[PDB]
Design goal:
0% helix; 64 residues; six-stranded antiparallel sheet; RNA-binding protein 5; monomer; mainly beta
């Protein structure tokens, strides 16, 4: 690792709040950030995800 930063920690300060939708648009990955729940919304699979700093990936927030 170290010399291969593929997926860093996303900062929702680089996001675009879509007022019409009510979500923060994530151009980084292509997801929707819910400001209230603080989770990521996959608009294709309609699922919720969160960023894990260790796995460097988005894991389903609905632990099931």
């Amino acid at each position: 690792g170290a010399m291969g930063t593929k997926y860093a920690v996303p900062d929702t300060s680089t996001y675009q709040y879509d007022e019409s939708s009510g979500y923060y648009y994530d151009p980084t990955t292509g997801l929707y950030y819910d400001p209230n729940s603080q989770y990521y919304y996959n608009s294709l699979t309609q699922q919720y995800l969160y960023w894990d700093g260790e796995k460097e990936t988005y894991v389903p927030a609905a632990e099931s």
